[PDB]
Amino acid sequence: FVNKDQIAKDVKQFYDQALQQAVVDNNAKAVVKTFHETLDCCGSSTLTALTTSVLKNNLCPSGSNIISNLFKEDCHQKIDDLFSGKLH
């Protein structure tokens, strides 16, 4: 069973669908904050407009941002690194 690649892609798509709804409209915000918090990331390269709107809603609560808030880990890359086993 489970192939790393299809799951990584499913997770990204699930993240992407919540990030979209979280902006245009929630359970979606809750999911987005959980992903940002758990994975330590904020939006995605693949979704720049969505991603610029994040601060407007405080979907990416800083805390560790002490010099700038401009720079972010990409959630897609966090998702791939989770399944690749690179985040330890």
Partner: single-chain antibody
Amino acid sequence: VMLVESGGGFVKPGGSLKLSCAASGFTFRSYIMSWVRQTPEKRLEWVATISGGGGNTYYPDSVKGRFTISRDNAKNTLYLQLSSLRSEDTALYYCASLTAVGDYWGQGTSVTVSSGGDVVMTQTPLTLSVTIGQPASISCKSSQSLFDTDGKTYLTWLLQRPGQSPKRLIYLVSKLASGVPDRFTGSGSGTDFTLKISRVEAEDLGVYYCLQGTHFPLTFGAGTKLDLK
């Protein structure tokens, strides 16, 4: 503990070099890393930033398309490919976890480009000449408010001692960094900011810079040199 750059050199206009930076002693893969360059006239310029995982890269317009920042987390190395080099690119290029929680700098590797072989930050004065024990006060003003939607005011002060790399001194306007003595005080708000030294000691001499991190691109003040009368 350690960042060590190499790869710089003497290159012809239109030429190409690739800089690297070997990191050790901290959790590199989770550190958003930057390159910052220091020109022959001693301005600091932000060149590039890359996320921990390498998925997000950021560049100011002056280098965008010409320079490529990358990293190899398994080798604990940070890279900067330079191309279409020109004479205004001549600088000391520092590796630094500039925007990270820990403030770490390499020692710079130089690029000299030679056939021979945005928010404005205004720092006054350009040089303040002092006597040991006498108090100091340096000003830095921005052309736009540094107060983010965030609620935080990303104004940073750094100091570069003679022969050293720059060092974060204070962040978010007033909060001191690790090991900074209490005779430094940072104040200000909106577009006006001040660094005051109670009592100048010989460890305080060098060039102070302010840095704003609210508006893209990152920008620095031109620097105030503190020296002796």
